[PDB]
Amino acid sequence: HMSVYTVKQMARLSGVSVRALHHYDAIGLLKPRAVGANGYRYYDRQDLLRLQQILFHRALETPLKDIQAALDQPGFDLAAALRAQRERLAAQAERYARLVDVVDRTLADLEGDETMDDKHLFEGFDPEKQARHEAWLVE
Amino acid sequence: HMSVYTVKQMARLSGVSVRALHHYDAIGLLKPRAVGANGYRYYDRQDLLRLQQILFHRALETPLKDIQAALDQPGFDLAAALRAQRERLAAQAERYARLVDVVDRTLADLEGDETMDDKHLFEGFDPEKQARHEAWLVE
């Protein structure tokens, strides 16, 4: 809330390194807002929430330049951004949980009479991740 | 089980493109084993299980060359490989579910008195994904 943090403290609190925070600072992505009377710069609550936004974007494989754009958007609403991120994180949790179900079904067939239909081997894989890989194979 | 598939059929069944399967074939990753009397090559059940292994590896961001190595390992046990993949897929599902919890806790603080401790903003992020990004920032 009123707490403010040096780079050393922000690293320890967030798990982002001092190296990364200096880089995020240099490129205008995350600049410590709070300034003391000694000219030192400190991360405040608003900076912590922006860094959390950066970590959510990276969890969701958003590329570094796209992050700046998304955060600096005029009329940026943090609660809206969080709800959109929730939906995409939930969908990733459901994909991974579906892929465990596929492993479970495959193991049981495999240690059973091996009668399970072939198509059931392949339900659950991310079509998006396949397109980005077939596109790569065309070099 | 006894079913065998052309490239066109294997694409339709698996969701992998004809382009990718020809590439997987060329580089020795997945070569249709079953051969007919007309010299044509067909994917059998064992090929379907190897392709499922490739799709699990790609879900778990294993690099293409590492896949060959892992599948061609002497004493390769498919049920062992599946159980190891289960554990890593489950862990990804738990990470994504934890990140939704973090969003939920943050939203409720944000629309509340904003008293939640700062450290709670940052629990749940993948430290591995952070190291691979701080390492990248050193170019």
Numbering used by the authors:
A (entry chain A), B (entry chain A): 0 to 138
Passage from the reporting paper:
The TipA (thiostrepton-induced protein A) class of transcriptional regulators found in diverse bacteria is viewed as a minimal autoregulated MDR system.
As a result, diffraction-quality crystals of SkgA were obtained, and the structure was determined at a resolution of 2.5 Å using the single-wavelength anomalous dispersion phasing method. Although full-length SkgA (residues 1–255) protein was used for crystallization, only residues 1–138 were observed in the final structure. The established structure consists of the N-terminal MerR-type HTH motif, coiled-coil region, and the initial two α-helices of the C-terminal TipAS domain, whereas the rest of the TipAS domain was still invisible in the current model, probably because of structural flexibility or diffraction damage. Because MerR family proteins reportedly function as dimers and SkgA protein also exhibits a dimer conformation in solution, a dimeric SkgA structure was established by combining two molecules from two adjacent asymmetric units for subsequent analysis. Remarkably, apart from the coiled-coil α5 helices, the α6–α7 region and N-terminal domain are also involved in the dimeric interface. Fifteen residues of the α6–α7 region of each protomer interact with the N-terminal domain of the other protomer via hydrogen bonding, ionic bonding, and hydrophobic interactions, which contribute to stabilization of the conformation of the α6–α7 region. Eleven residues of the N-terminal α1–α2 region exhibit interactions with ten residues of the α6–α7 region via hydrophobic interactions and three hydrogen bonds formed by residue pairs Tyr4–Asp117, Ser16–Glu133, and Tyr23–His132.
